[PDB]
Design an enzyme around this catalytic site. Structure first.
Site, PDB file in Angstrom:
ATOM      1  N   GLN A 246     -36.591 -40.179  31.633  1.00  0.00           N
ATOM      2  CA  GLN A 246     -37.645 -39.303  31.147  1.00  0.00           C
ATOM      3  C   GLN A 246     -38.969 -39.648  31.771  1.00  0.00           C
ATOM      4  OE1 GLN A 246     -38.080 -38.921  26.783  1.00  0.00           O
ATOM      5  NE2 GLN A 246     -38.562 -36.850  27.054  1.00  0.00           N
TER       6      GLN A 246
ATOM      7  N   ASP B 297     -39.349 -38.958  35.341  1.00  0.00           N
ATOM      8  CA  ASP B 297     -39.870 -37.623  35.326  1.00  0.00           C
ATOM      9  C   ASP B 297     -41.120 -36.999  35.335  1.00  0.00           C
ATOM     10  OD1 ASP B 297     -39.995 -34.638  33.975  1.00  0.00           O
ATOM     11  OD2 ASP B 297     -37.838 -34.431  35.147  1.00  0.00           O
TER      12      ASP B 297
ATOM     13  N   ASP C 200     -43.645 -38.673  35.341  1.00  0.00           N
ATOM     14  CA  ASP C 200     -44.839 -39.290  36.180  1.00  0.00           C
ATOM     15  C   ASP C 200     -44.906 -38.449  37.252  1.00  0.00           C
ATOM     16  OD1 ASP C 200     -45.763 -40.780  38.273  1.00  0.00           O
ATOM     17  OD2 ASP C 200     -45.689 -42.539  36.878  1.00  0.00           O
TER      18      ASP C 200
ATOM     19  N   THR D 226     -49.547 -35.639  39.506  1.00  0.00           N
ATOM     20  CA  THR D 226     -49.390 -36.071  41.183  1.00  0.00           C
ATOM     21  C   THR D 226     -48.061 -36.366  41.305  1.00  0.00           C
ATOM     22  OG1 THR D 226     -49.617 -38.728  40.623  1.00  0.00           O
ATOM     23  CG2 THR D 226     -51.596 -37.454  40.862  1.00  0.00           C
TER      24      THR D 226
ATOM     25  N   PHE E 143     -46.673 -38.611  43.714  1.00  0.00           N
ATOM     26  CA  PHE E 143     -46.446 -40.029  43.859  1.00  0.00           C
ATOM     27  C   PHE E 143     -45.865 -40.603  42.826  1.00  0.00           C
ATOM     28  CE2 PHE E 143     -48.019 -39.033  47.966  1.00  0.00           C
ATOM     29  CZ  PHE E 143     -49.218 -38.466  47.838  1.00  0.00           C
TER      30      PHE E 143
ATOM     31  N   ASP F 231     -46.719 -42.981  40.875  1.00  0.00           N
ATOM     32  CA  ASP F 231     -47.976 -43.657  40.485  1.00  0.00           C
ATOM     33  C   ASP F 231     -48.460 -44.171  39.146  1.00  0.00           C
ATOM     34  OD1 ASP F 231     -48.931 -41.258  39.884  1.00  0.00           O
ATOM     35  OD2 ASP F 231     -50.396 -40.867  41.183  1.00  0.00           O
TER      36      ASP F 231
ATOM     37  N   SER G 230     -49.102 -41.927  36.889  1.00  0.00           N
ATOM     38  CA  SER G 230     -50.093 -40.990  36.364  1.00  0.00           C
ATOM     39  C   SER G 230     -49.847 -40.659  34.843  1.00  0.00           C
ATOM     40  CB  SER G 230     -50.031 -39.700  37.480  1.00  0.00           C
ATOM     41  OG  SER G 230     -48.501 -39.550  37.390  1.00  0.00           O
TER      42      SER G 230
ATOM     43  N   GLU H  97     -43.805 -36.249  22.634  1.00  0.00           N
ATOM     44  CA  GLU H  97     -42.288 -35.081  22.388  1.00  0.00           C
ATOM     45  C   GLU H  97     -41.195 -35.841  21.448  1.00  0.00           C
ATOM     46  OE1 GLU H  97     -38.989 -35.884  23.806  1.00  0.00           O
ATOM     47  OE2 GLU H  97     -38.136 -34.097  23.480  1.00  0.00           O
TER      48      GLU H  97
ATOM     49  N   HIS I 110     -30.830 -34.350  30.207  1.00  0.00           N
ATOM     50  CA  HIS I 110     -30.653 -33.695  28.916  1.00  0.00           C
ATOM     51  C   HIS I 110     -29.382 -34.000  28.215  1.00  0.00           C
ATOM     52  CE1 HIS I 110     -34.514 -31.091  29.668  1.00  0.00           C
ATOM     53  NE2 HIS I 110     -34.908 -32.189  29.483  1.00  0.00           N
TER      54      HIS I 110
END
Ligand code: HEM
Ligand SMILES: *[C@@H]1O[C@H](CO)[C@@H](O[C@@H]2O[C@H](CO)[C@@H](O[C@H]3O[C@H](CO)[C@@H](O)[C@H](O)[C@@H]3O)[C@H](O)[C@H]2NC(C)=O)[C@H](O)[C@H]1NC(C)=O
Ligand SMILES: *[C@@H]1O[C@H](CO)[C@@H](O[C@@H]2O[C@H](CO)[C@@H](O[C@H]3O[C@H](CO)[C@@H](O)[C@H](O)[C@@H]3O)[C@H](O)[C@H]2NC(C)=O)[C@H](O)[C@H]1NC(C)=O
Ligand SMILES: *[C@@H]1O[C@H](CO)[C@@H](O[C@@H]2O[C@H](CO)[C@@H](O)[C@H](O)[C@H]2NC(C)=O)[C@H](O)[C@H]1NC(C)=O
Ligand SMILES: *[C@@H]1O[C@H](CO)[C@@H](O[C@@H]2O[C@H](CO)[C@@H](O)[C@H](O)[C@H]2NC(C)=O)[C@H](O)[C@H]1NC(C)=O
Ligand SMILES: CC(=O)Oc1ccccc1C(=O)O
Ligand SMILES: [Ca+2]
EC number: 1.11.1.7
Length: 595
Positions: free
Chosen positions: A105, A108, A110, A184, A186, A188, A190, A258, A351
């Protein structure tokens, strides 16, 4: 005749060109084509979109128009007739820990995020859609089939809003509708720092030159930090327990709260940034705040890439690993690093790996408290259980000691997610993630199962007998044909997840292909890939290979016992060892002298 004019919805800016740090938006990774892989742009299309009217309408939108001659079955019926099951016994993966599901997760989030459409603040569409189930515009409700128990108890449908698209977002039309990737492409980190200038800044601690991320000021977890609280009310995290009134956490990615285990992971990462940050100052005292932030940030990006490619993909892809992701060979400026639209659905194999419960273990790895085992659904958007019920250590121990749920053809997705999923926006624990997924495949204009088999160069069954052989399961092949009439209509999400798993893997052939190509690309087309000569020095890479999730744990919690290979299934205490024995990341290689 191409069309690459369209664009604006994108925050753009100039490039630095000899700068050692990735931008927050992902722009400038690719010098010849600067916006490639950037956030807030369209997901790449590996095949043309497939819509009811060829442009934007989803299949199943106009109940009369068919797909290849047949009606496409309601997402919820499919969920009901194939995805559900009642008995949780015997469903756990005997050789994959709960962390296996959780990392997935994290990678994902990211890589992709297609937010739902707005134009809805102070909106009645927001209600014309939940109260009356009237299909229209961005409201594409999931209808309940006759005999569904939710009928009697919830309504005629499940609200659902279409995903955002480019060039605008309001009433648009022209070319084919392409969804947005708000993050993004990549790998990275994020999700820790954000994909926008704004949020990245608000997340940082700028009242001081240490280059640290902002931390919660209302609560601490045994001296250790917490992600800061989120400003915005109405908060869903406070709706679930209006007496505890604990808001959601503010992080680099909006889905961070979440579920409690995803919030725990985000916290572990935040903590590592600060740790890494105060450590780097200590070796290079003159470095300012920017330099401390970017440098730590880059270390962490290299960390996620390593754990993902060295320890995670090898046990998702299994023996197919090498057939798609060959040994690294250097940056290839011709490789398109954009996340494809279909990947965001292929990565949803996760999932079916989520078990029905989450446990907390005290220090001997024994049930912590009386009500130690909680049902998953009580933890969607639950931050109060962290702040007021023991911190994250008890949850992290559960991650290392409990198992993931194994994907199984007769037991795919737990009812915790299939009937009791909680939406942000709505007020009940009654959604269906499996039905949402299928509904999203259509919203996104995905080609059918057979289009993707062809794409991956795999046989394409046209008959029941054909499907039985591929699924290697008479009964499921049967349920699938009765509902779809033709394997060409089976939505990619369920079609791909119903295949047997490859040797040593956790996904089948179609998915292994879809996953494999995507990762090969984000690696080869990332100018900042950690193994790319010049990004890090030879001596820094020798240091980065000793990174372990076990260690990440030891340095940011008060857990002293951890498995050496945290993704395989481990038994306490035999497979656990003292933190004192685990390799540490050596930073002295980052020391930069003068004179
Ligand atoms: C609750 C949810 C989870 C666990 C308790 C969960 C878990 C995962 C894992 C383990 C994934 C990969 C290994 C993974 C991938 C993607 N998710 Fe899922 N997820 C839970 C809940 C949701 C919800 C709701 C959505 C949104 C569905 C929608 O279409 O509205 C969701 C999405 C995704 C997603 C698509 C991301 C995007 O690009 O927009 C994955 C690739 N998850 N999840
Ligand atoms: C539970 O899952 C484990 C991982 O799938 C598995 O152990 C792994 O088995 C592989 C077999 O190839 C071995 O992999 C490593 O082997 C050498 C080191 O001796 C490396 O040079 C290779 O590159 C490769 O990474 C390991 O022995 C092990 N891998 C790891 C990372 O621990 C278990 O067999 C599974 N348990 C059962 C019962 O099947
Ligand atoms: C909403 O959040 C509340 C916590 O903020 C939670 O109640 C809390 O949990 C239990 C009550 O079930 C209490 O803790 C237990 O341990 C204390 C130790 O001092 C014992 O005295 C009791 O046995 C007690 O049960 C917390 O003190 C309690 N806090 C409050 C303010 O009630 C609610 O259960 C949550 N509500 C829901 C629906 O989840
Ligand atoms: C930004 O960083 C500063 C400095 O690290 C934090 O201030 C410290 O906070 C802790 C707990 O409040 C204590 O050691 C001191 O009160 C502060 N020390 C100094 C030197 O200021 C501050 O908490 C951070 N700000 C945010 C929003 O996270
Ligand atoms: C760099 O990436 C490109 C694009 O993926 C690779 O290009 C393929 O190479 C063969 C042989 O030159 C071409 O005939 C094909 O047209 C390309 N295939 C596709 C699907 O684009 C190239 O091999 C890579 N080069 C290096 C040195 O890594
Ligand atoms: C994408 C993901 O994991 O997001 C969510 C699922 C259900 C409800 C809310 C969210 C969220 O991001 O807010
Ligand atoms: Ca990213």
């Amino acid at each position: 005749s191409w069309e690459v004019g369209c664009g604006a919805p994108v925050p753009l800016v100039k490039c630095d060109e000899n700068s050692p740090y990735r931008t927050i938006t992902g722009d400038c990774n690719n010098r010849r084509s600067p916006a490639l892989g950037a956030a807030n742009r369209a997901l790449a299309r590996w095949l043309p979109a497939e819509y009811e009217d060829g442009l934007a309408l989803p299949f199943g939108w106009t109940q009369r128009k068919t797909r290849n001659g047949f009606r496409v079955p309601l997402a919820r019926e499919v969920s009901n007739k194939i995805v559900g099951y009642l008995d949780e016994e015997g469903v756990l993966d005997q050789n994959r820990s709960l962390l296996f599901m959780q990392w997935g997760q994290i990678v994902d989030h990211d890589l992709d995020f297609a937010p739902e459409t707005e134009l809805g603040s102070n909106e009645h569409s927001k209600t014309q859609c939940e109260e009356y189930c009237i299909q229209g515009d961005n409201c594409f409700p999931i209808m309940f089939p006759k005999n569904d128990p939710k009928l009697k108890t919830q309504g005629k449908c499940m609200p659902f809003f279409r995903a955002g698209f480019v060039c605008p977002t309001p009433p648009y039309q022209s070319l084919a509708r392409e969804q947005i990737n708000a993050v993004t492409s990549f790998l990275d980190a994020s999700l820790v720092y954000g994909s926008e200038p704004s949020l990245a800044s608000r997340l940082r601690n700028l009242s001081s030159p240490l280059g640290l991320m902002a931390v919660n000021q209302e609560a601490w977890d045994h001296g250790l930090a917490y992600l800061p609280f989120n400003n915005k009310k109405p908060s869903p995290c406070e709706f679930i327990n209006t007496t505890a009134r604990v808001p959601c956490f503010l992080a680099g990615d909006f889905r961070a709260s979440e579920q409690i285990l995803l919030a725990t992971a985000h916290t572990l990462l935040l903590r590592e940034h600060n740790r890494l940050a105060r450590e780097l100052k200590k070796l290079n005292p003159h470095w300012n705040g920017e330099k401390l932030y970017q440098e730590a940030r880059k270390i962490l990006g290299a960390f996620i890439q390593i754990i993902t490619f060295r320890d995670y993909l090898p046990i998702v892809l299994g023996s197919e690993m090498q057939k798609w992701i060959p040994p690294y060979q250097g940056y290839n400026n011709s490789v398109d690093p954009r996340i494809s639209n279909v990947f965001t659905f292929a990565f949803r194999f996760g999932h079916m790996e989520v078990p029905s419960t989450v446990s907390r273990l005290d220090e001997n790895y024994q049930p912590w408290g009386p009500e130690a085992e909680l049902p998953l659904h009580t933890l969607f958007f639950n931050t109060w259980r962290i702040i007021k019920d023991g911190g994250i250590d008890p949850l992290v121990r559960g991650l290392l000691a409990k198992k993931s749920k194994l994907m199984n053809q007769d037991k795919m997705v737990t009812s915790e997610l299939r009937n009791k999923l909680f939406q942000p926006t709505h007020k009940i624990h009654g959604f269906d993630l499996a039905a949402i997924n299928l509904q999203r495949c259509r919203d996104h204009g995905m080609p059918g199962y057979n289009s993707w088999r062809g794409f991956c160069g795999l046989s394409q069954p046209k008959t029941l007998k054909g499907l039985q052989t591929v699924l290697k399961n008479k009964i499921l092949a049967k349920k699938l044909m009765d509902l779809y009439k033709t394997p060409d209509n089976i939505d990619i999400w369920i079609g791909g997840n119903a295949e047997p798993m490859v040797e040593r893997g956790r996904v089948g052939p179609l998915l292994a292909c879809l996953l494999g190509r995507q990762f090969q690309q984000i690696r080869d087309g990332d100018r900042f890939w950690w193994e790319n000569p010049g990004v890090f020095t030879e001596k820094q890479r020798d240091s980065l290979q000793k990174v372990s999730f076990s260690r990440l744990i030891c340095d940011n919690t008060h857990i002293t016992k951890v498995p050496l290979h945290a993704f395989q299934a481990n038994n306490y205490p035999h497979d656990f060892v003292d933190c004192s024995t685990v390799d540490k990341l050596d930073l002295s290689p980052w020391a930069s002298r003068e004179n």
